[PDB]
Amino acid sequence: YGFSVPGLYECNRYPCIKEVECYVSRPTEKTVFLVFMFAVSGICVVLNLAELNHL
């Protein structure tokens, strides 16, 4: 997923005629959610690594 959800998508898959433009719903909220989840997962990874180092 990368780090952001773009508001525009360029889609060139059948049956679409050549290349078409599609518009995503509430991309900013999904981007915020994605970044927040990545941060939480990173915090979990850091804590688990600290526990492993302690072991």
Determine if 21 is a binding residue for its own copies (CB under 8 A): yes
Q: How far is CA 50 from the centre of its chain?
A: 26
Determine if 19 is a binding residue for its own copies (CB under 8 A): yes
Least Å distance, CB 19 to its own copies, is 6
What is the dihedral sign for C-alpha 32, 38, 40, 43? negative
Least Å distance, CB 10 to its own copies, is 8
Determine if 51 is a binding residue for its own copies (CB under 8 A): no
Q: How many residues bind its own copies (CB under 8 A)?
A: 5
Which residue, among 38, 53, 43, 27, has the nearest Cα to 2 in the 3D structure?
Answer: 38
